[PDB]
Amino acid sequence: MPRLCRLVRGEQGYGFHLHGERGQFIRRVEPGSPAEAAALRAGDRLVEVNGVNVEGETHHQVVQRIKAVEGQTRLLVVDQEDTSV
């Protein structure tokens, strides 16, 4: 089920990699980072940024939303670990 992660930026950044396919996914979370502290996980799909649904938006749009409030972001994410193929 989706869950909320509340991040406070560090000096370098948040410490995650966003990778776009369509959907945006957290491809990597840096050890010891704000992202890790917030319990963001690699593989999470990003559903909302700061309370706004981003499903359908481009990668650039979503990155802009993450940057929009200096220093903090809240990410509603869903970790999918089941897929029938």
Side-chain angles (χ1 to χ4, degrees), residues 26-45:
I26 308 295
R27 177 170 272 224
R28 160 169 152 102
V29 171
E30 179 183 329
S33 67
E36 184 177 77
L40 202 58
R41 297 178 222 157
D44 276 337
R45 186 162 60 80

Side-chain angles (χ1 to χ4, degrees), residues 37-80:
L40 202 58
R41 297 178 222 157
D44 276 337
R45 186 162 60 80
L46 193 42
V47 175
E48 295 183 359
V49 177
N50 297 344
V52 178
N53 186 290
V54 297
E55 304 176 291
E57 290 195 343
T58 62
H59 179 81
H60 176 67
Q61 282 182 287
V62 175
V63 172
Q64 286 304 103
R65 287 189 184 277
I66 296 165
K67 297 168 165 191
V69 174
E70 187 190 274
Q72 52 198 67
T73 197
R74 67 185 189 279
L75 303 176
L76 195 74
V77 292
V78 57
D79 184 9
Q80 181 79 264

